[PDB]
Amino acid sequence: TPRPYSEIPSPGDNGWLNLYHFWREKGSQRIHFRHIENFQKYGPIYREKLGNLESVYIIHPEDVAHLFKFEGSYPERYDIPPWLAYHRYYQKPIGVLFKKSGTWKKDRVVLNTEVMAPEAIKNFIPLLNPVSQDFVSLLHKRIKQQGSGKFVGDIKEDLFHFAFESITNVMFGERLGMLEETVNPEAQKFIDAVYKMFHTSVPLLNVPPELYRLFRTKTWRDHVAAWDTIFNKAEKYTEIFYQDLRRKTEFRNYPGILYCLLKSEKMLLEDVKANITEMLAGGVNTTSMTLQWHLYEMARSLNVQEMLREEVLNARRQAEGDISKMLQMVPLLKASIKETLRLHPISVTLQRYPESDLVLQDYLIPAKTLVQVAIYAMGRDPAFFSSPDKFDPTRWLSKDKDLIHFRNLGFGWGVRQCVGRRIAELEMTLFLIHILENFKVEMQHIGDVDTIFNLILTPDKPIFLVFRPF
Ligand code: HEM
Ligand SMILES: CC(C)CC[C@@H](O)[C@@H](C)[C@H]1CC[C@H]2[C@@H]3CC=C4C[C@@H](O)CC[C@]4(C)[C@H]3CC[C@]12C
């Protein structure tokens, strides 16, 4: 017989007490640092009730592996209480992100065909490639601007525009010029909405939703706003683009996600609005943060920067073909992006509600218990990755002296991984080929940035990169 649940280490059955402590330690935004200290204290597995919210935490691959066995046919991750609250309170139509059960599966079948299938992928090359050339050119238009043949600065906001264009061009097939001299201000409103939503969710996560108006009056006003912006704006684009092909449509030429989901005819109207809103939202900061960190890391290690340049300039003068042909000749690059998600995951953890009881390590895990995967922490532990500080793309391809191998979880796993997984991977892969055949990025000084918890994980201080041609 396994050890009983209530026997899993934990810091105490008293949820409220733990919250006092959490709140006194200033843990609200260090929730990934605590993982690392908690596992160091309790060992491979532990519990921690905060108020009424209890969950188990794992870190060893073999466990994650096992836990996934019982995730189900229609899985279920943790549901952000503030996000969920806004929609129910306002009664806004939800999509894949909140959808539950066969209702959920229905949309995701459609959605895979249109954003994950390896022909809706090939149909993206042309939509994405050009947006990444336009970003090489914005950098070009800055090097010849500072005047001394280089560029110094924090390009984060350009990473946002880049990204928002990329997700808009693939869902709508029209360009927005967020990489122009003067960008759209209505589109900067939506972009800063998506990041305002995130940022204002943190203080709302460990407090009863229906108590927001008293213990969190301000943070709730702001988070409610940020969603409003997200909705109206995504709703606008969806109208003025429905009508962009509603009349003038006597030919062929893309995947227009908005179009395809109107032509496949496998989804009701109500949901396309909602799902598009959610996709649009997903492109804005995720790729941005990740791309930033990749560049950051390339500057931390030149020898690796050069190996990537060598393989990119090798699938150019040894493919002669366009971009399509060289996307299969760049393994180190793609692995580079996983080595990034390793060191800098967007998701601090992955969570699954087990369909049926199971046993982790040696403890009973009752079905329907929140179990969580310490992605951030697994990334930093030397018990899983030799010298976990080192940026080592070769981690994700050795396959010869490995007796064991684990797959990268930055995107999650199983049938309810990131539906935008594929779009993001290709979008970043192209941006880097272009950045790699054009600039030798560095950093002005010793780089020492650490991460901070803001729903998604972001770097804590601005990052200043240096681009120089070749
Ligand atoms: C580097 C970029 C990205 C990363 C790392 C990322 C990461 C992931 C993670 C870890 C999850 C939870 C996975 C799980 O439950 O197993 C998720 C959910 C999801 N993300 Fe992404 N994602 C990002 C890009 C995108 C893109 C561009 C979109 C929209 C196109 C977006 C929208 C989604 C949606 C809507 C789902 C929910 C899917 C579902 O529950 O069926 N994300 N993402
Ligand atoms: C509408 C958009 C928010 C879609 C964004 C999505 O592309 C992505 C960035 C989201 C969707 C699911 C999210 C997770 C939901 C719940 C967990 C547990 C929580 O305690 C920390 C955040 C964390 C780990 C979230 C990280 C951010 C994720 C991975």
Question: 1-470 belongs to which CATH class?
Answer: mainly alpha
Dmax (CA) for the chain in angstroms is 72
The finding on whether 349 has its CB within 6 A of some atom of ligand 2 is: yes
Name which residue sits closest to atom 19 of ligand 2, judged by CA.
455
- Residue 398, classified by CB atoms within 10 Å of its CB into exposed (0-12), middle (13-18) or buried (19+), is exposed
Nearest alpha-carbon partner for 72 in 351, 354, 360, 418: 354
Q: Are 35 and 374 in contact (CB under 8 A)?
A: yes
| Phi, psi values for residue 153, rounded to 5° | 145, 175
The residue whose CA is least distant from atom 23 of ligand 1 is: 286
Of 440, 443, 442, which Cα lies nearest the Cα of 469?
Answer: 440
Q: Residue 384: which of 70, 63, 68 has the closest Cα?
A: 63
Pairing of strands 451-454, 350-352: unpaired
Residue length, the chain?
470
Q: Is residue 281 within 6 Å of ligand 2 at its C-beta?
A: yes
Residue nearest to atom 27 of ligand 1 (CA): 283
Q: Is the CB of 242 under 6 A from ligand 2?
A: no
Query: Which structural technique was applied?
Result: X-ray
Give the three-state DSSP class for 173: coil
Q: What residue segments make up the domains of the chain, in order of their start?
A: 1-470
Contacts of 197 (CB under 8 A, 6+ apart): 83, 223, 226, 227, 230, 455
For residue 260, say whether it is annotated as part of any ligand binding site: no
CA distance 437 to 236: 37
Dihedral angle sign, alpha carbons of residues 131, 132, 137, 138: positive
Give the DSSP H or E segment for 386.
none
Residue 315's Cβ-side half-sphere holds a number of Cα atoms within 13 Å equal to 21
Ligand showing the shortest atom-to-Cα distance for residue 419: 1
Q: Cβ < 6 Å from ligand 1: which residues?
A: 77, 96-97, 108, 167, 278-279, 282-283, 286-287, 290, 346-347, 350, 410-413, 416-420, 423-424
317-342 burial, b at 16+ Cβ within 10 Å, e below that, comes to eebeeebeebbeebebbbbbbbbbbb
Helix (H) or strand (E) holding 7: none
Q: To which residue do tokens 């894949």 refer?
A: 96
* Token code pair at residue 244: 């962009």
Nearest to 428 by CA among 154, 128, 119, 115: 128
Nearest ligand to the CA atom of 456: 2
Task: Among 271, 339, 418, 458, say which to mutate for ligand 1: greatest number of ligand atoms within 8 Å of CB.
Answer: 418
Tokens of 399: 């396959």
CA of 201 to the centre of ligand 2 (A): 11
Nearest ligand to the CA atom of 453: 2
Q: What would the two tokens of residue 270 be?
A: 């109500």
